[PDB]
Amino acid sequence: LPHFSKDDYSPESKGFVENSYLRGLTPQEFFFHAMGGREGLIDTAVKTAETGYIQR
Amino acid sequence: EESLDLDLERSNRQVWLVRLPMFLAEKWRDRNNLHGQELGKIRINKDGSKITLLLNENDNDSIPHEYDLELTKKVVENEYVFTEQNLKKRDRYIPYVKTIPKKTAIVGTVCHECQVMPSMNDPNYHKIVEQRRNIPKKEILDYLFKLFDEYDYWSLKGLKERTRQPEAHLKECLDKVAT
Amino acid sequence: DPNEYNEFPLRAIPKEDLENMRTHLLKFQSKKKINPVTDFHLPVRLHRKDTRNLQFQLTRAEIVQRQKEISLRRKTRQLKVLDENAKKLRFEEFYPWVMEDFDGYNTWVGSYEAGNSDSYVLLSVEDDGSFTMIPADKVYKFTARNKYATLTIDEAEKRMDKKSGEVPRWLMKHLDNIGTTTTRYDRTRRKLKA
Amino acid sequence: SLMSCISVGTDPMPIITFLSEWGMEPLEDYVPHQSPDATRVFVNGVWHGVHRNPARLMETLRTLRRKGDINPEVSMIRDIREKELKIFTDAGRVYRPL
Amino acid sequence: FDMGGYFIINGSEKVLIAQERSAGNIVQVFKKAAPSPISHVAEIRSALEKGSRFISTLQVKLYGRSSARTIKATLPYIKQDIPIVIIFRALGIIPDGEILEHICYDVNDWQMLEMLKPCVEDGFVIQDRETALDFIGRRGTALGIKKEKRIQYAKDILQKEFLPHITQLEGFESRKAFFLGYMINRLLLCALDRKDQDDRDHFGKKRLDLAGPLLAQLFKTLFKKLTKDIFRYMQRTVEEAHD
Amino acid sequence: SFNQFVDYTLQDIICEDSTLILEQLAQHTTESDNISRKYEISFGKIYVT
Amino acid sequence: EGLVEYIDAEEEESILIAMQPEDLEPAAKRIRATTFTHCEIHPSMILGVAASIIPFPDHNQSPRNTYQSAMGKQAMGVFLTN
Amino acid sequence: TTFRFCRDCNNMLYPREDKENNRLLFECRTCSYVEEAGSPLVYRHELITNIGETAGVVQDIGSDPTLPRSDRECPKCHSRENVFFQSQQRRKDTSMVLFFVCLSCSHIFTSDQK
Ligand SMILES: [Zn+2]
């Protein structure tokens, strides 16, 4: 993400949301959270059609 | 009329090639220019390696007068400049492919190429940058006999122009004797 | 600066001479320096010829020796328009510039490049020191051709067809030892000897 | 997003002429040996030639687009790792202020 | 409060929606799957705003996973892919070292040069530009006064249609050659694993079409239809009059 | 986008293809001879209301 | 006069951004390089129109944001004044 | 394993064998120029490649911002400024080697601990 220098592997740079829902998220962590949720949604939206066909 | 060979004695001449800024090229590719006059002066060091152009005030200050002439290439090889003015006027080789080799003439070789660059300190210099940003049954019967005698395949259209007559009268006459 | 150099600012060309002449630019393609006025079997006839089957073309010496030995309508159409200068350019460069020696030992074929012929401009010092002022019009690049007895299309097709796992390594040398497809200079030499 | 905006395109020819005038080698006399490390210059994909000293051009174009003499939709990148320099001026890009 | 960029068609407020697409006129590489005979390909789309839709798709293909080491380049309207040395001669580069100077840039490295040796051996067949230009690519239309192909016709292909950006006029073959060499270098870097596989879901390689471009598409199509119709009724007003 | 398409891009798309000509000299032999009847149609500046 | 810059989607492969205008600018609440070329205007402007209505959106789950951004277009209120 | 081109016409010389004196005659195939090679090695494969980790060292790496900076010293100039980055040759089985380049000495050095 364009807010860090190159070639890091420290967990906050690659996406460890250290914080908690009470304290809220620093915006980078907010973005990574959005990534994970989006992955879940698209997986649901494909698996439902395929499982319906195979059930029929 | 003349010979079919090119000129050779002007091979051993020094020619200098200039890359030019486009406004200056348009000023210097004019037919109302090009009259032997000298609109500037050049300045080489004794050691070389730096030339400014001392342009005279004939340009009237719209363009600069101090031009850092940068020698792009010091030594240039395999370069020959030639002219062509028009001429005064298994062994089946084609003699004439309509090649018209006019009076072709060498006029020298090139050793240096340089680029004209106006020096930015001039007020007209870098002003140009924002400028760039800114921008009759029996008679016709005998007459027919001569006519097919002239040409046996005489057509109806050729017959009609040779008659200028009523066509129904024309057609009933033709078939009565011939085609 | 003191007069340590030929300070002759430009003397422009005769305007009356400017008409009916065009001064193009010659370019050669080899790492070695080439001077044709020394190397070439003069006379030199720079012509604009078609290059179709130039292997079987004319040697000037061979031509001289041969001469010495002998002696409904559609009524409807549409011109999709094109620029007149571009069309004239197409017509002019429909044949390229070719220059050879008298022998045909070494030939050079030009072609047109349209990079920056307009921006270039010529300055030559003359014998008196006159600095002549020529706006250059076009530049042509010349490459030497058939200096090594080039092969031909049909047997080339039989070579490149996938009949062999690899084509013969010395196939051109074997064809030359057989004697077919000689050089233009060799053809000129044979015609001169016979 | 809220401050996003869309490029509307601008004619590249003034940039091309300008960039020639501040020192290029047009491709027609480029040779790899004599410039073993000079930088390629692209404008909307079309290569236009190679240039020797890239940093001066890069900062110059930055200053020029900050002075307002180039339509600020124009985007430049000096990919230092590969000796590249790109200019983009087509329509349809997405940009946000900073 | 009605700041709104929309249209009124038949009294109902209609709105456009931005479309997107891949960026035109930009280089992409690929790693097609193992069972196909092709391993790596490069693509160039093109356009020229936007006469007859200017698709003009180009590929450079690679074969094998050894001995099938060859670089065949597809091209309209040439019905077979061509080894690239033919194309270099066709553009007018004869000597092989300078084909290699077009392709690779660091003369010190070699792995690309051993990677290119088989294509040079393919290029051993033809040693002259028109003797390369002759090669077939029929794909219509009817041939005129020819022997096999007009050299004029092939060079007209390479001038007018081929790679319809960098130029289209008559005289920029060296530019075409360098562009091709750059493309080959990118493909070869991808297959030589010094540079990684390209990405398609990088956002910058996309553009957003929008109201202006969409109206441009409809307007160009409709006006060309219009020009065809006005060219009709003008040739066939053989009888009077000039309406 | 709309303003760009109206101010420019429209005059451009017209002027890129304005010309249309059927200049008739004879389109066969004779006709004696005849002259070059320039039936030409081309578009100029456009207008918007 | 060079205070803000338009940046497309690619120069981010060439630049470096700061969150706050203080985050590295001088050398029990929340847990939070010296070569910055740009600083972003305000991090809340990565959102969109619908999602700019959710109060404290950094304090819940992302799929819940996605639901709310869907449902808000189905809400009713006024829409114009004429 | 490099290529030698024919000086008389820029085409690479090909291996061909003396039939009687048994020498490596790199002959041109375009023209008839011939050349005697130096070593009996002709073809070369390298089925395993492990090179490229220090790629693209341009003379002005430090002009980029996005490279990080550290405090190790260049063991030629001992300047405390330096720039480091990952190995360039992006394979799935490369390492975590860091290559340090200093702006002062313009010199590269690694931190291997074998
Ligand atoms: Zn040779």
Ligand SMILES: [Zn+2]
């Ligand atoms: Zn050091």
